[PDB]
Amino acid sequence: HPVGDADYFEY
Amino acid sequence: GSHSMRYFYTAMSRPGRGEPRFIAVGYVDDTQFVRFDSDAASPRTEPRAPWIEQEGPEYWDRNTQIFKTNTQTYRESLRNLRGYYNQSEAGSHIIQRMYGCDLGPDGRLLRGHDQSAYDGKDYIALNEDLSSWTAADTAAQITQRKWEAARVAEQLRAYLEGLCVEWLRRYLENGKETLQRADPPKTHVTHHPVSDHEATLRCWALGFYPAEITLTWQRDGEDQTQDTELVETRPAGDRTFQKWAAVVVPSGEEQRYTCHVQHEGLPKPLTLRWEP
Amino acid sequence: IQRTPKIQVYSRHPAENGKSNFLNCYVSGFHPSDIEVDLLKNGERIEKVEHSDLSFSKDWSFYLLYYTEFTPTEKDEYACRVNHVTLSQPKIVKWDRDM
Numbered sequence: 463h464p465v466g467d468a469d470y471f472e473y
Numbered sequence: 474g475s476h477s478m479r480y481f482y483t484a485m486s487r488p489g490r491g492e493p494r495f496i497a498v499g500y501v502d503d504t505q506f507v508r509f510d511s512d513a514a515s516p517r518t519e520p521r522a523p524w525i526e527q528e529g530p531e532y533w534d535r536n537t538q539i540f541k542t543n544t545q546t547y548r549e550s551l552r553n554l555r556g557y558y559n560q561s562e563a564g565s566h567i568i569q570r571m572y573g574c575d576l577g578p579d580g581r582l583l584r585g586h587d588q589s590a591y592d593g594k595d596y597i598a599l600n601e602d603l604s605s606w607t608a609a610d611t612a613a614q615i616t617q618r619k620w621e622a623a624r625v626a627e628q629l630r631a632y633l634e635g636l637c638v639e640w641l642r643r644y645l646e647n648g649k650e651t652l653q654r655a656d657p658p659k660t661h662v663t664h665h666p667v668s669d670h671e672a673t674l675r676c677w678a679l680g681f682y683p684a685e686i687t688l689t690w691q692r693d694g695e696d697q698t699q700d701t702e703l704v705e706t707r708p709a710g711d712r713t714f715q716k717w718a719a720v721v722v723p724s725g726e727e728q729r730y731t732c733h734v735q736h737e738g739l740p741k742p743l744t745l746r747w748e749p
Numbered sequence: 750i751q752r753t754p755k756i757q758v759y760s761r762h763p764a765e766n767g768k769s770n771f772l773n774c775y776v777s778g779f780h781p782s783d784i785e786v787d788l789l790k791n792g793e794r795i796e797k798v799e800h801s802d803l804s805f806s807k808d809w810s811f812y813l814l815y816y817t818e819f820t821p822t823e824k825d826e827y828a829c830r831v832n833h834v835t836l837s838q839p840k841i842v843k844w845d846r847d848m
Contacts, residue, residue, distance in 0.1 A: 463532070463640040464480050464499065465572070465632040468542030470623050473550035473568065473589070473597075473616045481804050483811075485782060498804050508802045521802070567781055569809055590809045593752065593780040663847065675847070679763075707775045708801075709761045710816050717848075 474655065474737055475583070476502055478641040479573035484547035486555075486566050493551050495544040501644050501652055503683045504712065509540035516541065524648030554591055557612035566592055572599075572629070574637035585633030603630035656682040656713060657738030662747045667721060674747055675719040676732035680709070687735040688718040694731075752810055753835035754779035756842045758828065764821045764846040772819040772844065774829030777812035785832040785839070786815045791825060821846070 479500045486493040498521075499507040506522040518536035520526045550568055560566070572587035587599035597606055597613040597620075604626050608617040620626065645652050658678035665673040678688055684706050690697045702719040709715055722730055727747050734743040755778040761771035772788055782803060788795045801814040819827065827844035 463636060464497065464536065464539050465629065465637070466535075466539050467625070467628060467632075468539055468546050470625060470628065471543075471550075472546055472619070473553050483782060483803055483805065496803050498802050500804075505802065505804070510802070565781065569805060571805070571807075592750075593809045665847065704757065705755060705775075705777060707757050707759065707773070707777075708814050710771055710773060710814060711761060715759065 474653070475576065475578050476641065476645055476652070477573060477575040478637060478644070479571055479586070482543065482547070482568075482570040484551055484568045486548075486551045486564075488562055488565065493548045495540070495547050497540050497543065501641065501648070503714070504648075504652060506644065506648075507536065509537065511540075511544040516544075522648065524644065524651070527647065553616075554596075554612065557615055558591075568596075569593075572633075574633050574641060576638065576641060580642060582634055582638050585630070585637065587629050587633070599626060599629055603633055651712070654682070655736070655738035656680060658686060658716075658734060658736050660732075660734055660743055660745055662732055662745050664727065664747050664749065666724070670724050671721050672724055672727065673719050673721050674727060674730055674732075675717050676734075676745060678716045678734060678736070680713045680715075681736055681738060682713050683737065684708075684714045685737065686714070686716055687733075688716055689733045690718055690720040691731045691733060692720075692722070692726075693729050697730075751835050752778055752780040754784060754831055754833050754840075756829060756831050756840065757848075758842050758844045759848065760821070760844075760846065761816070766822050767820060769818060769820045771816050772827055774815045774831075774842075775812070776815070776829075776831055777806070778810045779812075779833055779835070780810050781834065782811045783834065784811075784813065786813070787830045788815060788817055789828040789830055789841070790819070792828075794830075795819075 481498050483496045484493050495511040497509045506525045508521055509518045569590045574585050575583040577583045585603050589596045595609045597608050597616050606617045608614045658681035661677050663675045690701045706714050706716045732745040754776045757775045759773050788798050795817050798815050798817045805811045828841050830839050830841045832839040
């Protein structure tokens with residue numbers, strides 16, 4: 463299962 | 474054996490040809506089990522291994538939410554990086570990310586990974602301490618500062634030590650008949666004259682899983698590294714891999730050469746020679 | 750900046766004339782990811798070729814497997830034709846059953 467980092471992993 | 478889970482994200486801008494494409498694929502060792510492609514007619518997380526199909530709708534909906542959100546986030550990130558390198562709006566660029574966890578042969582976490590690249594060059598990587606970052610350049614230092622401010626490392630560490638390992642162990646159990654089965658290479662040596670005084674000996678390994686393998690030629694017991702042509706291990710398309718190693722030898726000296734094979738699927742490493 | 754593809758053309762199973770098999774063209778080591786790959790039969794593009802999902806290796810270079818069913822014969826010639834930004838012209842690699 464992938465990590466749910468979509469809301470904080472902006473480069 | 475030892476096992477790992479990895480997700481591979483590719484985000485690619487394409488000015489003039491719509492918004493950046495986001496693909497994600499997930500692997501356990503050398504077996505892909507999911508994909509998501511923002512270019513698909515109806516983008517959603519799709520199973521790519523039989524053993525993942527039993528996951529429930531909540532799993533698929535959650536994965537798809539994550540990847541859909543990522544699609545948007547990476548578009549912002551691509552814009553950010555273009556700016557960090559003062560690049561024009563004209564060019565196509567790529568962010569890649571690979572992350573995941575490794576277990577040792579006892580199911581314990583060996584180490585975590587979270588590495589990113591921009592246009593094929595190392596950009597930023599989570600250190601093995603799962604706490605600090607290594608930034609490749611002053612651009613990546615900007616990302617590092619942002620991620621340090623947002624507690625990013627802390628959140629990835631939690632994932633890598635927690636859910637990453639839990640899921641990987643679940644997958645390994647659900648797919649145990651394949652994921653925990655090592656198939657040894659079928660091996661043989663072929664002989665091809667290249668002239669009157671030389672011939673090619675080619676040592677073949679076929680039908681093996683996982684992909685990791687070592688194929689070497691020795692002459693009189695000495696490794697022939699420099700003189701061996703070694704092709705890249707390649708997928709057969711039925712889950713297994715293939716590889717060969719070739720050496721050109723003086724005619725009549727064939728028996729002085731031995732091919733050595735090491736593979737997880739082999740209790741005893743193999744020693745082969747040409748059998749005319 | 751850019752990396753040109755490595756190309757291998759080969760069969761899934763050992764080739765036996767008259768026996769159905771799969772023809773593979775494996776492209777790897779390339780960057781960026783856009784790439785054009787055709788399988789050819791006697792120089793003509795085979796129509797319904799499938800491929801794997803885009804992924805990449807530890808050095809960030811991309812790889813793809815293109816494949817189609819085929820029944821090898823003594824006379825038929827197969828090849829893989831590849832174009833990439835790094836190639837001024839498409840590269841053609843012939844299927845050699847000993848490779």
